[PDB]
């Protein structure tokens, strides 16, 4: 015997996240606070030169949200916990192959419903224990116990994304590796340096020298006609992101579909 909520079986598709907590989890829980960005910029402070106003957390959160979006496209991933209502077609060869299904959004934390319907009326709903999942790849497969295609025959409901990492330096396949946190940070810093590079001295000023009444000063900025003042930081960020992103793609791998 065994005890479990009916949709969730400890074998195959163990429960990981309560549905209600999905709304509670936010960017701050994953470490994407503006503080982290500031830490990486330790010793550099950005202000509006015309005033004493530094940019507030609103901009940082806004940038970070679009950064985590950009990383979510950079690998074909779902990067925050999110419920999906998916309708999928009937392809015979995969159907005969234990009803193999490749979810659009991966990883799969857990599967709630998996039904076969004809006109909105459920023709047949599978037992919970029958269906089994592969979290990282998102494969959903069925193991029954005791024309060549049609559209939108089956109805799939599941939760996609990654849980925050619980233990230091480690992550489960259903768990966020720390680099996606860092990668999104580095994508955020690209925008920040694209802002901060303009404000060091006036605007568009490469070289200056000023002499008054026996005191003289000369300054030569990193600004140039060919490259912007922060271009060195951006170009180093790219060098790290490329290594970071190429290595991480090996954790997920290439995508394949039959034809």
């Amino acid at each position: 015997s065994l005890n479990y909520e009916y949709p969730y079986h400890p074998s195959g598709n163990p429960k990981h996240i309560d549905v209600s907590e999905i709304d509670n989890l936010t960017l701050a829980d994953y470490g994407w606070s503006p503080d982290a960005v500031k830490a990486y910029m330790f010793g550099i402070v950005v202000q509006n030169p015309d005033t004493g106003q530094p940019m507030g957390d609103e901009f940082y959160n806004h940038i970070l949200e679009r950064a985590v979006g950009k990383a979510e496209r950079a690998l074909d991933i779902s990067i925050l916990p999110d419920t999906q209502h998916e309708m999928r077609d009937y392809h015979e060869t995969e159907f005969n192959s234990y009803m193999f299904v490749h979810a659009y959004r991966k990883p799969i934390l857990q599967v709630e419903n998996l039904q076969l319907q004809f006109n909105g009326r459920p023709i047949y709903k599978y037992p919970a224990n029958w269906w089994k999942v592969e979290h990282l790849a998102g494969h959903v497969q069925l193991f029954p116990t005791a024309a060549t295609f049609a559209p939108q025959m089956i109805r799939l409901e599941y939760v996609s994304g990654m849980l925050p990492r619980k233990k230091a330096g480690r992550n489960k396949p259903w768990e966020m590796p720390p680099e996606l946190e860092q990668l999104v940070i580095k994508y955020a810093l690209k925008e920040i340096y694209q802002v901060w590079g303009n404000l060091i001295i006036g605007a568009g000023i490469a070289n200056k020298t000023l002499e008054v009444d026996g005191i003289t000063e000369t300054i030569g900025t990193t600004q140039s006609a060919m490259y912007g003042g922060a271009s060195a930081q951006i170009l180093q960020i790219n060098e790290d992101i490329k290594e970071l992103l190429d290595g991480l793609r090996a954790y997920f791998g290439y995508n394949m579909i039959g034809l």
Binding site: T93, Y98, H102, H139, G253, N255, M256, I257, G258, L259
Partner: protein, 70 residues
């Protein structure tokens, strides 16, 4: 009764060697879509940088040293 019956090797170029979990999922998809009579005539699709197939044995095998035996 002994090895050497391979037809060839399918090389896929990548900057990083894919993790074994990814290769296992790759195998799962390949078996589910193409293995056996089911989905025999289908064609897979892959979006890697470059792919090669290198042949280790000829197109068709047959008995060797026939005239020697005769």
């Amino acid at each position: 009764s002994h090895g050497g019956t391979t037809r060839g090797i399918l090389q896929i170029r990548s900057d990083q060697q894919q993790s074994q979990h990814a290769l296992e999922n790759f195998k799962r998809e390949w078996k589910s879509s193409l293995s056996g009579i089911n989905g025999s005539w289908q064609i897979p699709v892959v979006m890697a940088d470059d792919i090669k197939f290198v042949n280790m044995t000829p197109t068709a095998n047959d008995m060797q040293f026939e005239k020697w035996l005769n």
